Design a protein around this ligand. Sequence first.
Ligand SMILES: Cc1nc2nc(-c3cccnc3)nn2c(C)c1CC(=O)Nc1cccc(C(F)(F)F)c1
Length: 288
Amino acid sequence: ACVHHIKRRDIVLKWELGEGAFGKVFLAECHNLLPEQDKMLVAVKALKESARQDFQREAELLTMLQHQHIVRFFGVCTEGRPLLMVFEYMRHGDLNRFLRSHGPDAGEDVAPGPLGLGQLLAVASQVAAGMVYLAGLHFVHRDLATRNCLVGQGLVVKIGDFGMSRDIYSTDYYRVGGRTMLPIRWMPPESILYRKFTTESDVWSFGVVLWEIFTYGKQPWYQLSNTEAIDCITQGRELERPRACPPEVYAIMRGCWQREPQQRHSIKDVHARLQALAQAPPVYLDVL
Ligand SMILES: Cc1nc2nc(-c3cccnc3)nn2c(C)c1CC(=O)Nc1cccc(C(F)(F)F)c1
């Protein structure tokens, strides 16, 4: 267990942000954590409840993951219950809420109104860069979706994996038997039929995140029931190009949605294509 430990006295809870089945999330002041900042804000997950094994296991993984575009783990408070995981506080919450709150249907890091192509591409670009880092570590995510990404000051987007997600977005899961929840709207046919998850099922999910990003957080197949969508995805039927989405981008999506996992573009490729675009000049983009 090679996990940075934090003293409970150094953590002062301010108030709750969110609930999950495995814990509650608080904003907290943390002291003497970063040397530049003798004080500073974090988010703290108290463990609720087999559950303590999970927490130890999550912590170890969160320490190992280190990347500009994967959520940032400060360490744990094991001294006295409840157990606390401490994380970087992301001011703008989850990319879904953020996307919904700056899309046509509805300050400091963002202009008023619909995000423009340039911003949309910078987001997709950041989520792609994260997914490079995990495919690097041969780490299969299995629930990649905008709800599972946070936005910070500067529009820094980071990938995590939340349980607040299975509770706030009950509707993004299909409950099968007792206690299992499947993000079926985000899964490839091989994940659904054979129940096989891989890097290749992750890049399928990336394409769906791309569609989320350019639809300003609409749910994939919102017009379908969970069984209508399973029919739809197994039967090979692809999501429509969103209004705000240039054909050149719908192309990167399509490469994520090849029926045959092997035939899907690598995430390094998709990243390359999107970063290219995100950093192309307004004159190049303005005619996409
Ligand atoms: C559970 C959780 N909940 C969280 N809420 C917040 C949060 C909320 C509001 C504002 N600012 C931050 N941050 N935050 C983190 C990092 C985790 C850990 C996690 O994301 N766990 C995790 C587990 C497995 C895999 C991964 C990863 F691979 F995707 F990174 C993350």
